[PDB]
């Protein structure tokens, strides 16, 4: 039936409806730190989120998304391996049922408790829909979450989850500053990949940060109380909404640091 993360509709079944699932540049992948190539040509990342305008938080079924106004260059990502300006449209997370799993990308096979994805699209394409049809249409910033000390900047997100427990529910979410979710350092790995959920389009430049952010056990616990199901339906907890690592194939992962 509809795709998901269950036993009968999980990632291993996706290829039946989305053949590209077995493509040449699928994500996520395992980052082998000893095989990554240091590239002195890579520029520092430029994150300009000072004018970011968040609008709403939505339970999309497979995750919850925090949406931003992308009708102007308010919150953009530039530099790094990117050519052009990419506007932030939304961010969401992937997490597990236990602290030992949850992230999509892994580092030397190590899994993190969760993974934050800040999605941006290339403005030269006019809109997000056009952008996903291009090889350099999207730029996704990936940040790992490890369980430890609480992240003050994440609490605002945590407190509103009760209002969007089931699929389809949304709530106004204005004046949220995404800068509170960034680690201290912006050193990264980068490689050409895809969207990790259907339609799995191979239109993404991945920028995965080396430094994880820490969140508290209580904070991640609240993520696990969300439901995949819609109201009035049998409760299915939203956990383990991550896709396992895919073959790197003929791709090279580059590092901005040595
Ligand atoms: Zn994602």
Largest sheet: 13 strands, mixed
Content of β-strand: 25-35%
Looking at this structure, what is the CATH superfamily?
Answer: Alpha carbonic anhydrase
Q: CATH topology, which one?
A: Carbonic Anhydrase II
The number of helical runs is 3
Mind sketching the topology for me?
Elements: E1 30-31, E2 37-38, E3 45-48, E4 54-59, E5 64-68, E6 76-79, E7 86-95, E8 106-107, E9 114-122, H1 128-131, E10 138-147, H2 155-160, E11 170-172, E12 188-193, E13 204-209, E14 213-215, H3 217-223, E15 254-255
Parallel strand pairs: 1-8, 2-15, 10-13, 10-14
Antiparallel strand pairs: 3-6, 4-5, 4-11, 5-7, 6-7, 7-9, 9-10, 12-13, 12-15
This protein binds zinc ion.
Description:
The chain has one domain: Carbonic Anhydrase II. The chain has 258 residues and is mainly beta. A hairpin with a 4-residue loop joins strand 4 (54-59) and strand 5. The strands form two sheets. Strands 2, 3, 4, 5, 6, 7, 9, 10, 11, 12, 13, 14 and 15 form a 13-stranded mixed sheet that branches. The protein has a two-stranded parallel sheet with strand order 1-8. 7% of the residues lie in helices and 29% in strands. The radius of gyration is 17 Å and the shape is globular. It binds zinc ion. The record marks 90 as: Involved in the binding of some activators, including histamine and L-histidine. Its cofactor is Zn(2+); Co(2+). Its EC number is 4.2.1.1, 4.2.1.69. Its main location: cytoplasm.
């Amino acid at each position: 039936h509809h795709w998901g993360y269950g036993k009968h509709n999980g990632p291993e079944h996706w290829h039946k409806d989305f053949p590209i699932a077995k493509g040449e540049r699928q994500s996520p992948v395992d980052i082998d730190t000893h095989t990554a190539k240091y590239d002195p040509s890579l520029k520092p990342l430029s994150v300009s989120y000072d004018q970011a305008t968040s609008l709403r938080i939505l339970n999309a079924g497979h995750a919850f998304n925090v949406e931003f106004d992308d009708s102007q260059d308010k919150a953009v990502l530039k530099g790094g391996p990117l050519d052009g300006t990419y506007r932030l449209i939304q961010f969401h997370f992937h997490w597990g049922s236990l602290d030992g799993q949850g992230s999509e990308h892994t580092v030397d096979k190590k899994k993190y408790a969760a993974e934050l994805h800040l999605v941006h699209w290339n403005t030269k394409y006019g809109d997000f829909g056009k952008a996903v049809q291009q090889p350099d249409g999207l730029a996704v910033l990936g940040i790992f979450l490890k369980v430890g000390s609480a992240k003050p900047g994440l609490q605002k997100v945590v407190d509103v989850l009760d209002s969007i427990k089931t699929k389809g529910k949304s709530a106004d979410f204005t004046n949220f500053d995404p800068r509170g979710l960034l680690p201290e350092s912006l050193d990264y790995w980068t490689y050409p990949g895809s969207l990790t959920t259907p339609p799995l389009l191979e239109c993404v430049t991945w920028i995965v940060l080396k430094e994880p952010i820490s969140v508290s056990s209580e904070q991640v616990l609240k993520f696990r109380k969300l439901n995949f199901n819609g109201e009035g339906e049998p409760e299915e907890l939203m956990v383990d909404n991550w896709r396992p690592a895919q073959p790197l194939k003929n791709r090279q992962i580059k590092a901005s640091f040595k």
